[PDB]
Amino acid sequence: RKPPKGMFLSQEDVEAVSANATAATTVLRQLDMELVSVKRQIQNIKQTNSALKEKLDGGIEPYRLPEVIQKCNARWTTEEQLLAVQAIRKYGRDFQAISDVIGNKSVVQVKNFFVNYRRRFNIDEVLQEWEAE
Amino acid sequence: PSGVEGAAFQSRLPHDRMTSQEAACFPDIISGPQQTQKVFLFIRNRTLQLWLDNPKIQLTFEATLQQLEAPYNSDTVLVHRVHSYLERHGLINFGIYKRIKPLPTKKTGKVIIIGSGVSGLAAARQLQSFGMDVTLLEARDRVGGRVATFRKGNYVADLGAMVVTGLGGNPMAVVSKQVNMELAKIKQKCPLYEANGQAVPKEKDEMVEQEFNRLLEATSYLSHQLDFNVLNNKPVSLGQALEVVIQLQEKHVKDEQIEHWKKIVKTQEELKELLNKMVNLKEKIKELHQQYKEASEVKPPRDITAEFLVKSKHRDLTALCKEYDELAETQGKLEEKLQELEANPPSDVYLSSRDRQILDWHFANLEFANATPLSTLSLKHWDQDDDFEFTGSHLTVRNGYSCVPVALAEGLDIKLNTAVRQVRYTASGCEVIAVNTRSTSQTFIYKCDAVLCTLPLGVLKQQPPAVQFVPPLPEWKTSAVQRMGFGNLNKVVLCFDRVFWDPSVNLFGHVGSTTASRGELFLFWNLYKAPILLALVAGEAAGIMENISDDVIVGRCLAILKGIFGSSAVPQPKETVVSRWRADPWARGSYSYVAAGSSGNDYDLMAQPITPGPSIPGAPQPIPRLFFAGEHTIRNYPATVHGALLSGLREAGRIADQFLGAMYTL
Ligand SMILES: CNC(=O)c1cccc([C@@H]2C[C@@H](O)N3c4cc(C)c(C)cc4N(C[C@H](O)[C@H](O)[C@H](O)COP(=O)(O)OP(=O)(O)OC[C@H]4O[C@@H](n5cnc6c(N)ncnc65)[C@H](O)[C@@H]4O)C4=NC(=O)NC(=O)[C@@]423)c1
Ligand SMILES: [K+]
């Protein structure tokens, strides 16, 4: 009902190698040459990708900035307020980014802020004006 | 198997049902009640047992019924019927037995038997033991036919058959207690050796053998599961099917390599896209840093847009600094999966040129067993006889297998150096015309009621005919003769003055440098007491090595043997015999094989007697007069000695049924 295990033998396979007196050798060459084809395409991209690895020497280490380990406060200095209105102008509704700029406020009171100070800081025309970008 | 049941097995009979032959002789029993069928079967099996437990004496009907017990020894006609059926068809009292009853003073009917090979001999002994006048016509100066044995001094080696294929169900077992044959078992250990001269290591040997066996089952799958049995309006051969299997294994090796490196590209390119991202992102981080440095260069206190510019660039830069870290976490994985994949590459080849040369030896062994190149064997049928294989070890004959035919010939009218040239068969009887092989001058005429032809199939095949049939044989018989295969297989007997080989291995191989020469001197045998090695020529090599002189051939043998054992341990052989069976005009080959486009049905066609037309038009249909036997006429055991012998046993039953009447069918 089934071939010996390891042996490969399908009805489609046998016809293709039996079509003529050279079909077998012809088919075995379409694959010798499909194998070369892929094999030096390999050493191509392997060698493109070795160029890109040099251009990344040193990584991004002269370029990192230390960590602002800053305890999260709750009151709103007028300074912290004006930073906020500008982040809304620059980041729309990305509350994580806005909480990262102001630094000492967590993402919830950013949401809280959007409401309590909504009339007074005119946050709707700001967001409108950010969507235009 | 043991008991009366083992008697049936040892006679190639099922113990628990009746055969087609018995249905024909005992149609009353078979259509009868299930209980009657069963009584018969015990009577048969018990009589077989009595014969088998002592085959050096005749087993008389009287002696049979004494040793039966009731209820079985109650019906005496059934016992007499069963005994006479067994006696007639060579299941008991065949071979070389002592006659309790001396045989009738005057005989009945005359039979001429062409050939005194084993099939001829075995018929002749049966016919003569049935009360017939028998004469055998033999072209050679010796009995045996293709059982040839070389003898010079204490040197003994078979040029013909040399193996008994196992005593389980084998009639040669009976003949073994009857004639003293020193039967010695064959150790199946066969160490291969390449053309370099050095042994193949166990690791390789087990690989290739199992690939060989696997390649064989592959062809069977092709044959019985994909109906790949005709290609280009021609029947497929075994060799054809083996190439197609091998090519498909070679193809699938290449298919696997392509799908492997196709995974390496599918990841090298996922890496390419990944590093183009870490360039274009490191260049944004290189720019933002500049912008943040400048914005932190504006000295405080700052107004709030300029403070937002610092804080904002700082957020934006740590954010791109985080994308770049997740992209080098992911980069790291991709650099590993590429030492994963390129450290586990699939198989480089299917078989190296070395491995194909050892595979070619296992193909020579197969070409040896079937005495023909695999390109000629029918894929469907080449193994149609494997189901009737005998159980047990294979054996050799240490005193030489000629001792069997020589023993059968005891007491028989044999004309040697008598070559039949024409067989004439008509409604009233037959005349055989033979010449003398020495002076073809002296001509002979033999008149008889029946001819039993055991001419080798290669002789029947010969064109122009070596033997003329008058009238000619019908198409249905000549076409079987054309379709069947007659193969070829030769031996070199090497006679030395000292053992220089391993005396504990019966047989060892030599691997050919090329496919075309795979059968050329590929195997050696140490079967005998004396220092004799024996060397096989199989496959396409067999036919070609017959145009090469003895000395050239014995040369290549010593070379190969020097390579194995070192150039100083091999003496020049004292005596050297090379067989040429395709040249032997009383053979034209070694034995038959199931040719592509043939089938086992041809072997039954070879067996059907010929019946001549009526002499007087409108006269009643006559009796058959021309009968055939020999190895090419027995479907389930072709190409062997036991098969010839059985074919002679059956024609004797058939001829006697015809000319003495079969009283046991009432
Ligand atoms: C698929 N096969 C397996 O499965 C198998 C299985 C196990 C073992 C074997 C082996 C192989 C080999 O290793 N050995 C062997 C070797 C050789 C070289 C040869 C040549 C044969 C064998 N035989 C076969 C065995 O040899 C033969 O099949 C029988 O001998 C048949 O004999 P028969 O049919 O009677 O015909 P003859 O030819 O004998 O007689 C006819 C007479 O006609 C005379 N004659 C001609 N012309 C005229 C004329 N014009 N006028 C008057 N007379 C004329 C002629 O002179 C002759 O006398 C093997 N079988 C084994 O069992 N053991 C072996 O060991 C094996 C293979
Ligand atoms: K072996």
Side-chain angles (χ1 to χ4, degrees):
Chain A
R1 271 282 167 256
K2 281 199 172 189
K5 265 88 166 192
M7 296 286 158
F8 270 81
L9 290 157
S10 68
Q11 172 50 252
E12 70 159 357
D13 278 4
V14 303
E15 305 190 4
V17 181
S18 35
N20 58 89
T22 40
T25 39
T26 276
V27 142
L28 285 225
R29 271 205 206 107
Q30 303 297 327
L31 297 205
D32 277 323
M33 278 165 92
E34 180 82 37
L35 194 74
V36 165
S37 180
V38 165
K39 200 168 270 193
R40 60 163 143 63
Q41 172 188 178
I42 284 282
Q43 189 177 341
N44 205 48
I45 300 166
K46 191 175 177 176
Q47 180 155 93
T48 292
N49 281 18
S50 159
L52 307 191
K53 274 162 62 185
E54 287 206 6
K55 281 161 181 124
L56 270 59
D57 69 334
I60 57 166
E61 287 324 283
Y63 294 61
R64 279 219 180 95
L65 307 173
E67 192 60 90
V68 189
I69 308 167
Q70 178 191 56
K71 285 194 173 175
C72 180
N73 216 307
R75 285 163 168 238
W76 285 95
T77 55
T78 309
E79 177 185 1
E80 288 152 3
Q81 295 186 25
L82 284 150
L83 288 175
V85 162
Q86 287 179 91
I88 296 173
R89 179 57 185 81
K90 180 172 185 285
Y91 291 106
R93 287 132 188 139
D94 180 342
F95 317 130
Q96 180 53 213
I98 296 168
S99 165
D100 290 342
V101 168
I102 314 181
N104 74 9
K105 287 184 172 59
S106 76
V107 186
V108 51
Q109 54 262 62
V110 180
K111 283 165 62 185
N112 279 105
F113 177 80
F114 273 83
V115 192
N116 303 121
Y117 282 122
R118 176 155 168 289
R119 312 180 141 214
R120 303 183 260 178
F121 279 167
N122 215 314
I123 295 90
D124 294 353
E125 315 190 15
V126 171
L127 284 168
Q128 267 166 345
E129 189 57 344
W130 173 92
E131 286 174 344
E133 70 88 32
Chain B
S2 71
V4 305
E5 310 192 355
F9 173 87
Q10 191 60 290
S11 305
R12 315 151 293 271
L13 293 160
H15 57 72
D16 59 13
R17 63 156 194 301
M18 309 180 62
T19 75
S20 203
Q21 190 165 27
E22 305 174 322
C25 300
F26 303 82
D28 50 301
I29 307 306
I30 287 291
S31 64
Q34 193 80 233
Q35 185 54 245
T36 299
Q37 311 193 12
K38 191 175 183 291
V39 184
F40 171 99
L41 292 158
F42 179 83
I43 303 170
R44 146 153 76 72
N45 296 345
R46 187 63 212 279
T47 305
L48 293 162
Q49 185 169 37
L50 278 171
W51 162 246
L52 286 174
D53 286 319
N54 184 11
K56 298 172 69 67
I57 60 169
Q58 180 170 11
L59 175 64
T60 69
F61 163 50
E62 293 93 13
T64 289
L65 180 53
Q66 306 309 156
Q67 265 156 330
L68 273 159
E69 298 200 344
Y72 308 119
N73 82 339
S74 67
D75 192 344
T76 65
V77 306
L78 191 61
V79 172
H80 182 82
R81 283 173 85 201
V82 167
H83 181 287
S84 299
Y85 155 86
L86 298 174
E87 204 176 23
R88 189 47 83 70
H89 296 127
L91 284 171
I92 66 184
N93 305 299
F94 69 87
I96 302 167
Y97 49 108
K98 185 175 178 68
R99 288 83 202 274
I100 283 185
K101 327 184 150 169
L103 50 86
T105 174
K106 186 35 63 192
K107 306 163 168 20
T108 313
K110 176 63 188 323
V111 186
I112 283 299
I113 296 181
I114 308 182
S116 64
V118 166
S119 58
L121 292 165
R125 276 195 88 86
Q126 283 302 85
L127 288 175
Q128 181 180 88
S129 76
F130 289 173
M132 281 189 102
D133 175 347
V134 185
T135 292
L136 299 91
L137 273 43
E138 174 45 61
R140 295 170 204 279
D141 45 0
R142 55 175 186 85
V143 304
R146 284 165 281 185
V147 172
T149 293
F150 172 72
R151 293 169 191 268
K152 200 159 156 163
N154 55 316
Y155 289 73
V156 169
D158 292 7
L159 279 298
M162 69 189 152
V163 189
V164 182
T165 73
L167 312 187
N170 186 326
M172 293 309 273
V174 181
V175 186
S176 57
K177 300 187 185 66
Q178 281 179 356
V179 186
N180 155 51
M181 296 168 281
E182 153 101 293
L183 285 143
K185 172 161 165 41
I186 276 164
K187 289 172 214 207
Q188 306 290 8
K189 177 181 181 185
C190 196
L192 275 58
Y193 291 76
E194 318 197 44
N196 77 342
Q198 267 164 315
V200 156
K202 206 129 144 123
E203 154 243 7
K204 253 314 198 161
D205 210 0
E206 319 214 331
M207 173 181 178
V208 192
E209 179 144 347
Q210 182 210 110
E211 207 54 34
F212 167 69
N213 295 300
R214 269 154 71 64
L215 285 164
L216 272 170
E217 326 180 10
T219 57
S220 198
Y221 179 83
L222 280 168
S223 172
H224 310 129
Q225 307 286 334
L226 307 190
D227 208 337
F228 178 68
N229 295 119
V230 164
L231 194 160
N232 289 5
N233 302 298
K234 301 190 290 189
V236 182
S237 70
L238 186 50
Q240 263 170 263
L242 285 176
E243 279 174 345
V244 161
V245 167
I246 287 191
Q247 288 158 1
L248 294 194
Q249 296 331 100
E250 263 168 353
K251 158 191 157 179
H252 163 279
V253 166
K254 300 180 192 296
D255 269 351
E256 277 310 2
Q257 266 157 29
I258 293 170
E259 163 167 347
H260 177 251
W261 312 95
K262 258 205 191 175
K263 287 191 207 189
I264 293 173
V265 290
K266 206 209 184 195
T267 62
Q268 290 277 95
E269 282 195 2
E270 202 169 12
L271 192 65
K272 171 140 155 201
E273 265 181 48
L274 195 77
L275 303 183
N276 271 100
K277 192 170 302 304
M278 293 171 57
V279 162
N280 285 44
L281 175 86
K282 170 166 172 190
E283 298 300 340
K284 271 180 198 91
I285 287 186
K286 188 180 283 188
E287 205 195 66
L288 262 189
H289 183 80
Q290 194 42 33
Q291 298 184 2
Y292 165 93
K293 224 52 164 180
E294 288 165 14
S296 190
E297 300 266 297
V298 162
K299 297 300 93 179
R302 289 190 272 255
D303 77 1
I304 206 66
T305 59
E307 192 79 3
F308 169 82
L309 185 74
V310 169
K311 300 280 191 47
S312 166
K313 295 298 180 189
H314 188 88
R315 186 279 171 173
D316 285 0
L317 196 144
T318 53
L320 304 203
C321 274
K322 174 51 43 154
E323 303 178 14
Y324 188 96
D325 293 341
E326 298 170 345
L327 263 56
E329 232 9 51
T330 274
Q331 182 203 302
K333 295 195 313 203
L334 295 224
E335 289 222 313
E336 134 261 272
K337 159 148 357 175
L338 290 187
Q339 301 214 322
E340 174 80 17
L341 303 203
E342 182 252 302
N344 286 358
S347 303
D348 182 5
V349 292
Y350 178 47
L351 289 153
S352 79
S353 61
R354 187 185 251 204
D355 314 354
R356 183 80 174 51
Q357 280 153 28
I358 294 169
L359 179 59
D360 265 349
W361 181 100
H362 290 263
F363 285 153
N365 206 44
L366 190 69
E367 280 173 344
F368 151 61
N370 295 263
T372 180
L374 314 182
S375 50
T376 73
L377 288 178
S378 169
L379 167 71
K380 206 181 282 195
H381 306 285
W382 79 274
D383 57 349
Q384 56 103 41
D385 70 306
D386 280 7
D387 271 20
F388 306 81
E389 196 193 9
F390 294 146
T391 80
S393 299
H394 292 194
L395 287 61
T396 63
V397 192
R398 287 201 109 194
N399 51 357
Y401 201 19
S402 86
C403 73
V404 159
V406 168
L408 295 186
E410 197 211 17
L412 301 204
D413 189 17
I414 304 156
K415 313 306 183 215
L416 306 160
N417 305 297
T418 319
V420 158
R421 227 100 143 12
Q422 183 149 121
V423 183
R424 271 189 172 259
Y425 58 99
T426 63
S428 49
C430 295
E431 69 207 24
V432 187
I433 311 178
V435 306
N436 194 84
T437 44
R438 310 165 277 220
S439 76
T440 67
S441 56
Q442 178 151 44
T443 286
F444 294 73
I445 291 284
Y446 288 95
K447 307 263 173 80
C448 62
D449 299 300
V451 193
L452 178 53
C453 180
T454 77
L455 279 166
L457 170 64
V459 172
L460 302 182
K461 266 182 176 281
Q462 180 168 357
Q463 292 304 300
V467 168
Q468 193 185 165
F469 288 90
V470 181
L473 302 172
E475 188 279 335
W476 61 262
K477 171 88 56 155
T478 79
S479 281
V481 170
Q482 276 158 46
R483 282 192 304 270
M484 277 179 67
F486 204 53
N488 190 10
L489 158 67
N490 277 307
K491 303 187 178 188
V492 191
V493 178
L494 286 148
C495 286
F496 295 121
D497 55 318
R498 50 186 169 260
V499 189
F500 65 76
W501 54 85
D502 194 348
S504 53
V505 293
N506 292 135
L507 67 165
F508 66 81
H510 155 261
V511 189
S513 46
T514 175
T515 291
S517 67
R518 68 190 183 193
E520 182 168 318
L521 289 166
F522 86 108
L523 169 53
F524 291 76
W525 305 65
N526 163 36
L527 301 176
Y528 302 109
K529 307 162 186 161
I532 298 146
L533 286 176
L534 205 155
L536 290 202
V537 189
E540 307 271 30
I544 282 161
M545 292 274 96
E546 279 183 19
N547 296 345
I548 296 304
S549 67
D550 284 6
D551 292 317
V552 180
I553 284 183
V554 179
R556 322 192 176 182
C557 285
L558 302 178
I560 298 169
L561 285 187
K562 291 183 190 300
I564 306 308
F565 292 94
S567 187
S568 70
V570 169
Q572 288 294 314
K574 289 300 156 59
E575 294 293 338
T576 40
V577 185
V578 164
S579 89
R580 292 178 178 81
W581 283 103
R582 188 73 76 193
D584 187 344
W586 317 124
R588 303 300 192 195
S590 65
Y591 45 88
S592 58
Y593 74 78
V594 190
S598 186
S599 78
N601 198 243
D602 281 343
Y603 286 90
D604 283 338
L605 287 179
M606 295 301 306
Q608 286 319 102
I610 314 289
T611 286
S615 287
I616 311 93
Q621 169 102 354
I623 310 110
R625 297 265 178 200
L626 191 48
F627 301 78
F628 296 83
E631 60 89 3
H632 61 293
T633 60
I634 186 162
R635 193 179 178 140
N636 297 344
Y637 313 85
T640 61
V641 159
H642 52 93
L645 182 144
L646 296 183
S647 81
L649 292 194
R650 86 167 181 269
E651 292 300 94
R654 197 203 304 253
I655 278 156
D657 281 356
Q658 191 56 70
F659 289 84
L660 312 192
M663 312 318 199
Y664 55 81
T665 41
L666 275 76

